[PDB]
Design goal:
The structure is cut from a larger assembly and holds chains A (about 210 residues), B (about 140 residues), C (about 25 residues), D (about 100 residues) and E (about 70 residues). Helices cover about 25% and strands about 25% of the residues of chain B. Chain B starts with 12 loop residues before the first strand and ends in a 20-residue tail after the last strand. Chain E has about 70 residues and is an all-beta fold. Chain E has one domain. Chain E is globular and about 35 Å long. The relative contact order of chain E is 0.34. The chains are: A alpha+beta (about 210), B alpha/beta (about 140), C mainly alpha (about 25), D alpha+beta (about 100), E mainly beta (about 70). The complex binds zinc ion. Chain A binds three RNA strands through strand 6 and helix 2. It is classed as ribosome.
RNA sequence: GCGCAAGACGGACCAGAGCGAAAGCAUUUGCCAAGAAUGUUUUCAUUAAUCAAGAACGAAAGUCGGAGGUUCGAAGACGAUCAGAUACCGUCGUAGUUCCGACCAUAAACGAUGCCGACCGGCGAUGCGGCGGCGUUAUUCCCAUGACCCGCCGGGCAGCUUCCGGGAAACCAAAGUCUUUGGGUUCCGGGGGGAGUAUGGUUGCAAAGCUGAAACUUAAAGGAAUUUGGCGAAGGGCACCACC
RNA sequence: CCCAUGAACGAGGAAUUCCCAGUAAGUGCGGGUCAUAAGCUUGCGUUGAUUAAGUCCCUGCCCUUUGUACACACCGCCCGU
RNA sequence: AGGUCUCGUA
């Protein structure tokens, strides 16, 4: 009888200046009818956009979560909320005749942004190796897990989120873990397969407007 | 009624979840946030036959209808997310996913990123049925 | 007639005999 | 009489293995006896591949691959024609089937 | 679709075994005379020799098996 | 799509790989106690192997008393298949599935093979510890250690071949060293039913557990392997009395 | 043999038969059945081309492997009220 | 200086 789309708006979401591409997409929201504010339906929004559509030229199988914190007008502002990996990549990384090492660390940054970083690692076969299994001892696995835990907890408490997100754009933490684990057992790839945001501090406006240039 | 920006500047992006089981096909188009949608068209509305709910024809017709509505609104490009039944029963998408995707991409739409969002569990409860399984 | 159901029926018969003896003797 | 040197499984010094569930059926079977099938498959086979390829937002893109593992009970594995009966001396051959396609 | 393609003529340089329920379809590896680079597997009805020229309406459809 | 609450559970990594007397055992970390093997020019010096009485543990189902009850699901309610289904199937669904106690002590608890000790062929792999040796890697040098490779030694789950040998055969480095019959020591079998029944004892709230016949009846019941028989088994070949 | 009366039949449902080189088919002529005797059968002539050089999908048959409590052999054997 | 670089085919 009546199309609700006539009573609809359109807003463009923005990305923090710490990334290259500023626009992401356009979201349709019902017009402000009655006492229900339109901006109230703009806060809890999560975008599962890949980093390829958010950076000039980088890895395309990594994804990030962006949460909106404030909208000025006809233009919504976002913030970092998490990061995940492609499910196909994770499925293809877990293969046979190799040991997977997992480790979750609950470490807070300088400010009250508590994150639970996860890690995944595998062992492989040397170019002259004949043993098809190429497993690892339990103590070696424990030592590797401790090394990964220490490496991640060292590069979080010393700095704020604003530039450790930039640090997360490449696998700098992964490369550091890979280089630090050459002595126990040679791993090939270290990935932070999931990052959750457990706690956030009191909402602030100055930090938000500084984030968007 | 139409797109908020010019039809020549860039492509307006929206995400579409295709849920396919061995007895139905679900096509759903929403905004990038996933909160507000556009329309929901499934093979259970097109063909009035339950035994033929999961078929390439029903999926094709539902995809054509949803693509026509999407073109009417003004959304140009779609990010497609496949999903099977998940839970604990099966992980293979139903027969309607292939035909639905081919139909909605042949309608004239543009397709971006593909991602599987099936709810595969690390460890679920006991599967339905007895110890000896479902024998027919 | 397999052994399992035969044993179950014999157990039922023994239970009946025991019950009748206990309510009668 | 005994048909196989083993007991139709790989349990030699354990005495118990984790029970899993079949995929085609719902039967609960031991892990080492249940036939496990690993399949590598793409999203589209030969029909929508062109439609995705030429009609796409991005160029120079590799199609994603769906990954899943299958567990088949013996009755379900044979009824779906995954394995078939062999000769008495042909059952002793443990070589995997040839793969060239 | 909004896709218009020219009518391409290809050369059958090899005939393979006949496919189908009753063997009514043969499989050949066509060869574009203008582009001596691609060898596409295409199914064609009727009797065909090795050396005839076909009329491929589309040059991308690689013929599959029965279904 | 975003948050909340509850219970169960530990996928892919997961293997003819590991540990435990058996049943059995998988998310990270912290604490407590124990054990096999390897190494030993340490210590005691026959302290040894198997076992009537007795004793601990013992899958799921089974009962009693508390807490929780997410999911699956005996009994039950309903609908279709069916000639007939209170069966196969589908939706709900109590007791149970979970934990803390108190009980039973049962399986195809199977390697259907008791334990200790000696000997008699070979060949590669895998997990542990020790030992010798080129060479790469933790970037380029020096050493110790991990990772890789080439061997050796001891114990352990297993693999392949054979006129050692054996068996009725299936097959077995043990199921061998057995009429050319004796290494040590426990339990147990005497044609097939009746029958693991009745009875007596005994343990248990109960369910049931251990010990356990006789009267009558039959000349068969059974183990291995070939040729045809049939499959609502698989895989091949042919036919214009099959097809395109 | 001659005259006259002129219905259905306007190319055929489900289903189904035969066949590929001088071929089906169109066409006519002999022998057998015969005192009267070809809508049958068996041969004989004449005109005459396409549909393919394959397959196991259907309808059937035949071998290999596999399982057996069946040997009069599935029309078998066999359990219970 | 020239303009589809050579051999086989799930
Ligand atoms: Zn099954």
């Amino acid at each position: 009888v009546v199309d609700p789309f006539s009573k609809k708006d359109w807003y463009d979401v923005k990305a923090p200046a710490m990334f290259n591409i500023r626009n992401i997409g356009k979201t349709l929201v019902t017009r402000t009818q009655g006492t229900k504010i339109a901006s109230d339906g703009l806060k809890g929004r999560v975008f599962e956009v890949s980093l390829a559509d958010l950076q000039n030229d980088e890895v395309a199988f990594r994804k990030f979560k962006l949460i909106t914190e404030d909208v000025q007008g006809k233009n919504c502002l976002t913030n970092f909320h998490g990061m995940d990996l492609t499910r196909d990549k994770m499925c293809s990384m877990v293969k046979k005749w190799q040991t997977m090492i997992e480790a979750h660390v609950d470490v807070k940054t300088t400010d009250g942004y508590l994150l639970r970083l996860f890690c995944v690692g595998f062992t492989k076969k040397r170019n002259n190796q004949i043993r098809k299994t190429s497993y690892a001892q339990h103590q070696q696995v424990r030592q590797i897990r401790k090394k990964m835990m220490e490496i991640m907890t060292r590069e979080v408490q010393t700095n704020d989120l604003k530039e450790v997100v930039n640090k997360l754009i490449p696998d700098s933490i992964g490369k550091d873990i890979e280089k630090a684990c050459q002595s126990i057992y040679p791993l090939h790839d270290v990935f932070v397969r999931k990052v959750k945001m457990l706690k956030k501090p009191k909402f602030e406006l100055g930090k938000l407007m500084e984030l968007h240039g | 009624s139409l797109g908020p920006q010019v039809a020549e500047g860039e492509n307006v992006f929206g995400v579409c979840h295709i849920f396919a089981s061995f007895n139905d096909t679900f096509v759903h188009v929403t905004d990038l946030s996933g909160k507000e949608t556009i329309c929901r068209v499934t093979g259970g509305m097109k063909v009035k036959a339950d035994r033929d709910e999961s078929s390439p024809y029903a999926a094709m017709l539902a995809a054509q209808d949803v693509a026509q509505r999407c073109k009417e609104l003004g959304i140009t490009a779609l990010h497609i997310k496949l999903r099977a039944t998940g839970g604990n029963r099966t992980k293979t998408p139903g027969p309607g996913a292939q035909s639905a995707l081919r139909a909605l991409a042949r309608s004239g739409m543009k397709i971006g990123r593909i991602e599987d969002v099936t709810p595969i569990p690390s460890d679920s409860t006991r599967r339905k049925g007895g110890r000896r399984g479902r024998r027919l | 007639m397999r052994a399992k159901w035969r044993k179950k029926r014999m157990r039922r018969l023994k239970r009946k005999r025991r019950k009748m003896r206990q309510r009668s003797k | 009489t005994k048909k196989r040197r083993n007991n139709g499984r790989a349990k030699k010094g354990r005495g118990h293995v984790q029970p899993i569930r079949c995929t085609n059926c719902a039967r609960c079977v031991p892990k080492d006896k249940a036939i496990k099938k690993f399949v590598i498959r793409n999203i589209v086979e030969a029909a929508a591949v062109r439609d995705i390829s030429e009609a796409s937002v991005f160029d120079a893109y590799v199609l994603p691959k769906l990954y899943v593992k299958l567990h088949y009970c013996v009755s379900c594995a044979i009824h779906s024609k995954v394995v078939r009966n062999r000769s008495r001396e042909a059952r002793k051959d443990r070589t995997p089937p040839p793969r060239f396609r | 679709t909004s896709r218009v393609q020219p009518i391409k003529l290809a050369r059958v340089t090899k005939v393979l075994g006949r496919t189908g329920s009753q063997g009514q379809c043969t499989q050949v590896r066509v060869e574009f005379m203008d582009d001596t680079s691609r060898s596409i597997i295409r199914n064609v009805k009727g009797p065909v020799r090795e050396g005839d020229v076909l009329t491929l309406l589309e040059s991308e459809r690689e013929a599959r098996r029965l279904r």
